Symmetry: C5
């Protein structure tokens, strides 16, 4: 059972694709294992670069294919490098850029709690064990977090053994491969969305209610039709700029709320008026519920967060 | 007639392209067949990885080219692997990611009933039979379906023989290739569209009718012009965010309905008024059809679903 | 002069790019010609697949490069295959996906009459004649045309000889290559555009005129400003969803019409009023031209289609 | 100093990228030079196609690398072809598709005067002279110009010598490479923009002024607020469909003009009214400047074109 | 310690991707170092072009892999070229196009101060020193800056030594690689954004205030609802055309300001009216604060720039 030591260097995690639950990772992979001692020119280790590596394979030099279990597509491999030591051991170092997959929940969108994952595992080797895994998130935590879209925490390794129940016609015990699993926790940067979506959406819902401080009945009603048109004009601006998803986010709900608030008002206003015993006996208290549901909406809103 | 045993491992079905009727599939293919026993170093099976396989072909080792009948483009092949057994048999294993085609009907868009298909078939072999086909949809049915865009059911195999009537100048019987056909049934997740499109669209159509609870004639009419402008502002928001298609979906019809409801009203309102024997004799009952077509629209709507 | 027999199998014609006059074609190409008889292992034809073909070339086996005259870019080649017969003849079969060009006129957009073309021609061979060309449009005419964007008719071949006047320093007669030209005629599916663009645009133009059935002068005018705003809100929805072009379509003109109809009304309304001999002597007949240009617009519209 | 004769065949110039000042060019390149006579099989010229050319290089056959100085990226090379003559001379022919750069000024957008350029130049050869350059714009001038976005004129060659002041540690005179420069002049097709942007934008500015033919003061003012909202609704439609740039076009200015015209009116209207010696003494002439700046706007507009 | 002399020729810096903090760079790289003198055919330097270089490597000729530390992906390499001198020294010249990364702050968007950076560094060599670095920004400073999106200043080099604390199991001192760092300072072109966003946004905020010069109370309020709808209609036009970011820009704030100004007015107007001791005693001074916050907004605005 060959012992391999992997070292992943994360350089940048970007381009999150909300719909496909994808994110790009740029970094380097380093694998080290020991082989039958070799005669290296001079004596100091031999450095084999790109094109050359493929040659050394054709001459027996074995090199284990380490797959990225959770990769969408196939990584963009940069510079490959083989460092051959005289005492046997071999060190493989290559830079990569790939798109990884993982279960991502964007229900609370504006305030996300996501976690980026890598999953290494020998493509075709039952007894080729992954010794120790080390990840260098040499990125800067409290650096300039208000410049980048996501804020992080700290790395997280975890080696394990995966058992497949439908392999080759093998029975003895060939069905356990060692898988390195890296995890990075990150939180989304609320800022932008608060000051450009939540806030103004609120001022719209607020000024929405000021339709009650209108005297006439026609004014009270005809104005909420211009108010309806405003929430639609907003849902457009919101949608054209927000990430498409299969489910509704928080913001998606604030928009529904704005739709109900205005439909509620429409009902009250066309109720207050025709709920009479004459013709214009608008219930002085209902027509003056200018403070009834404006705060009664912070009660329906503080129950959806409970 | 060589016997081949295929095994498809579906890992993720994503990126559905409504307009081109495309969808992406990530997984592995495993093909097994038996050949003339061989002398493998040691004795335990020989493992040939990437670069190497192409070499073994140049030395006679045959490997059937298995085409993906319904693939748009050419699959993104990851790690290839040849496992050569001493008793002959050969096992080919490779990871792939490709875009597949299939007839997709999106008439009832918000509520779709689609089915993802794969179609394997030897690219150039008449008598090379596909033995047994197995698919491991090791994805989780009732897991977190309210996180993913589509909900599934269960795999579905089916081997068969395809007959081409215009092949080489061959007559005997060379015109029957065996094709593996995999089918996966899936249903779209209505949620999002209901709570962010259907609902608010209804509140717009509802409050649309409240144009009748207006006293004056000018108010009753001039307001439906702001109401018209509202449905348009909605069709914009809807279109910019929904999947472009060559035909109309359900939502596309609700939008037409909102257009007709407002045009109907426009006709009634400019009828009730000028349908007099004086000048302002607005038919007290028609001007008060505030409950005539609001429910008479649930009759025109429940006949389109019949 | 080598005789070559081509057979094109169109599998799907999609992704029309209005602006670049591009369209994608997926299918297979089959070329057959006869060479100096060969000794094939066994005796039955020899099958050379992908990688291998490039090898047989290096050993003399000649294979003519057949260019796709009208291809934007370079086709996405799938599986290549050489079938070598003992009696000489060679059969080349490969699957392709490319983007083709052609002059496309989208003037009557909603109702297009386009034609998809392919153009094969030996890249570097003067006397290498293309024998017979056959195209298998094994797609289904009256199948589910109301599911696909385009409706077709039937294939259409045509071999010819092209003469270039500026080739190599050759004089004898080297300047005539044989070009296969395939043509497929198609018509666009009006549906969607009628029920989602033409119709509602008409209800807007119709209800546009009902600005005359208003009593006051201020109402008659101030209302047409909200009517103007409506046609603009529509041109936005239309444009964001329709295909960008360098010229105006039919729909683009109906939009101009709605702009003139409203500007015409603006003139009449601000004429009828101030065309007096007092101050409010609104020409009873002009102010009541509620049926003058509404049908007088079907006369200006039925002359643009003449 | 090797004499090379180049021949560029422009097939289609499309996809202009306003922001990056890019445009795509499809065509063929033909380079001819004479070498040490060779023994060609048979005697008639030898035809070397794709894969093969790379082989002949490995056997000494030299082939000058001709770079495309102004190419963004790297051309999409199609079919390559080497025609080797017995008398020495070699003819290189290959089809290409690349993205080229050039300084493009879109200040007068609707009416552009641009020029597409190509720039060939030996990548690594001081004394390898480019003999004669010929371009076949075998496209059709007055053909169907009202179908294509751009209208042309006629080709334009020009060979020259470029001097680099910072090359290798060479002094003698190695610093002059011959560069072929092709230029094609083209004009944009105004049509669409006039009938779908300029015209309707004018009818909006025109009907804008008719806010003066209103009696009351409140009507005269409150209506220009719906007029303001209209120009904005237009800038949206315009922007979403027009090409993003770093500077303002003509249309971009007409939109500013419409903004000023309405702000001007806002000032006059709120001046005429409060510029009294009572309360409602609206200067009969100013309130009746219904023809003052409507034509006084054709004076401010005919000075921006002077 | 091999001495290498690099020379970077920047040809064009374009395609800034605000969200990913990326920018494209086209140019050539030139690396020179001296090796063991060689016998070159003739005597004058040997020119090795593309395909060939890979060959000379297989025959020992070493070529250091120089990585682009801050590259997203992997550069698009054009023509490679090896110039081998008899006296040893080797000169590597290749054209590239890659996407580079760097921290970019777009807080003051309309007026940006950004800096484009390149970072070279030997991929696998501890003692391979980079001698002198030279960059030829042979672009034209005060040329046509009002045609390009960005304005520059002047190049800026800087060689240094980077120390990695987690390399191979090496202790002596193998952990210091030499890195070339190029920096180019650039400023964004405000123009467009001023005349198409800032200006018209101001005329909207300006004319926003003229809601005070309205007599009635209903007019003063109902008009600000059409004014609100106007700022939203603007945020839409702005957003669809501006670069998506995770934070708010200057323009994003002017939009918030217009939202507050109108919400402020809404409060005042619904205060002035109901802040009585009767019913319509609108505080003659407050209702006439037509000059209170219009200039009192230039005070809140000149404190956000302080």
């Amino acid at each position: 059972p060959v012992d391999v030591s992997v070292s992943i260097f994360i350089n940048k995690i970007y381009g999150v694709n909300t719909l496909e639950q994808t994110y790009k990772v740029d970094g380097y992979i380093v694998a080290q294992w020991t082989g039958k001692p070799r005669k290296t020119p001079g004596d100091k280790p031999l450095i084999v670069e790109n094109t050359q590596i493929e040659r050394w394979i054709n001459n027996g030099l074995w090199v284990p294919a380490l797959e990225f279990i959770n990769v969408v597509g196939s990584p963009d491999t940069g510079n490959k490098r083989l460092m051959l030591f005289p005492d046997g051991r071999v060190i493989y170092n290559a830079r990569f850029l790939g798109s990884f997959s993982n279960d991502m929940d964007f229900r609370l969108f504006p305030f996300d709690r996501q976690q980026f994952v890598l999953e290494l595992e020998p493509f075709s080797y039952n007894n080729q064990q992954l010794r120790f895994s080390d990840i260098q998130v040499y990125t800067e935590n409290i650096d300039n977090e208000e410049i980048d879209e996501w804020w992080i925490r700290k790395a997280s390794t975890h080696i394990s053994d995966i058992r497949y129940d439908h392999l080759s016609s093998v029975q003895p015990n060939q069905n356990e491969f060692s898988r390195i699993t890296v995890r990075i926790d990150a939180v989304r940067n609320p800022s932008y969305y608060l000051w450009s979506f939540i806030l103004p959406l609120g001022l719209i819902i607020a000024a929405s209610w000021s339709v009650f401080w209108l005297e006439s009945f026609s004014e009270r009603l005809q104005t909420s039709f211009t108010l309806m048109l405003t929430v639609v004009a907003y849902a457009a601006y919101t949608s054209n700029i927000l990430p498409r998803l299969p489910y509704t986010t928080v913001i998606d709900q604030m928009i529904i709320a704005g739709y109900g608030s205005i439909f509620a008002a429409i009902l009250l206003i066309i109720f207050a008026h025709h709920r009479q015993a004459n013709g214009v006996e608008d219930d002085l208290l209902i027509q003056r519920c200018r403070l009834a549901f404006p705060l009664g909406f912070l009660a329906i809103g503080c129950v959806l967060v409970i």
